[PDB]
Amino acid sequence: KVYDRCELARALKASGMDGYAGNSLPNWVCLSKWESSYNTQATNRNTDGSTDYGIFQINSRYWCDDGRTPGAKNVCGIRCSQLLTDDLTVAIRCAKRVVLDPNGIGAWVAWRLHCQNQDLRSYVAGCGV
Ligand SMILES: CC(=O)N[C@@H]1[C@@H](O)[C@H](O[C@@H]2O[C@H](CO)[C@@H](O[C@@H]3O[C@H](CO)[C@@H](O)[C@H](O)[C@H]3NC(C)=O)[C@H](O)[C@H]2NC(C)=O)[C@@H](CO)O[C@@H]1O
Numbered sequence: 001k002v003y004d005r006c007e008l009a010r011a012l013k014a015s016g017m018d019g020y021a022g023n024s025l026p027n028w029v030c031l032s033k034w035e036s037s038y039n040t041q042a043t044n045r046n047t048d049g050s051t052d053y054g055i056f057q058i059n060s061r062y063w064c065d066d067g068r069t070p071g072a073k074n075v076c077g078i079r080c081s082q083l084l085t086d087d088l089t090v091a092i093r094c095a096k097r098v099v100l101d102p103n104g105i106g107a108w109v110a111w112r113l114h115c116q117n118q119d120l121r122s123y124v125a126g127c128g129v
Contacts, residue, residue: 001086003038003055005029006127013129015092021099025129026120027111028095032056033123034110040091041084054083056095056108063094 003011009029012018018025035057036042044052049070050061060069064080076094083091098107105111 001040003032003040005033005038005123006129008032008038008055009124009127009129011088012092015088017092017096020096021104023099023105024120026123027105027115029123030115030118030120031105031108031111034114035108040086040088043084051080053080054091055088056083056091056098057110058083058091058094058098063098 009025012028013025017023017028032038032055036055038055040055042054042057044057046052046059048061049068050059051066051069052059053064053066058064058076058080060066060072060080062073063076064078064083065072065074066080076097078090078094083094099105101107
């Protein structure tokens with residue numbers, strides 16, 4: 001599914017992402033936009049044999065099993081395929097796990113690049129949340 005910006009903002013807010021591990025909602029909408037353009041079906045293969053999956057582009061080297069990644073740890077304990085559904089439940093539960101590591105939201109390259117230190121007001125403007 002390709003989510004609408006406010007539609008995504010509502011589903012994240014409803015799922016307890018606003019303030020999760022100290023990351024306000026606009027952080028999460030900004031990284032989703034830059035990482036996947038809001039598409040739950042987005043996939044991107046890396047040089048290292050790993051692949052990024054879903055709206056949050058979670059990486060297969062550490063977080064999910066895609067059965068073709070060398071040295072994979074599957075910390076979320078899931079199949080990467082579960083990260084591509086229109087339903088965000090599993091993706092959200094795994095992104096919540098990812099942010100608890102030491103690097104926090106800095107785990108996401110797109111956040112570091114386009115959201116960190118930025119004015120993110122625009123990502124939730126007009127959503128009424
Ligand atoms: C920039 C790139 O070529 N790939 C982007 C990629 O880095 C992103 O996946 C990020 O990969 C890094 C590197 O493997 C992951 O960070 C590691 O996470 C472990 C779990 O917390 C730590 O123990 C390691 O210390 C740490 N390595 C480093 C060197 O910081 C990061 O977890 C990961 N992120 C996600 C999200 O799955 C993905 C997403 O930005 O896309 C690109 O491939």
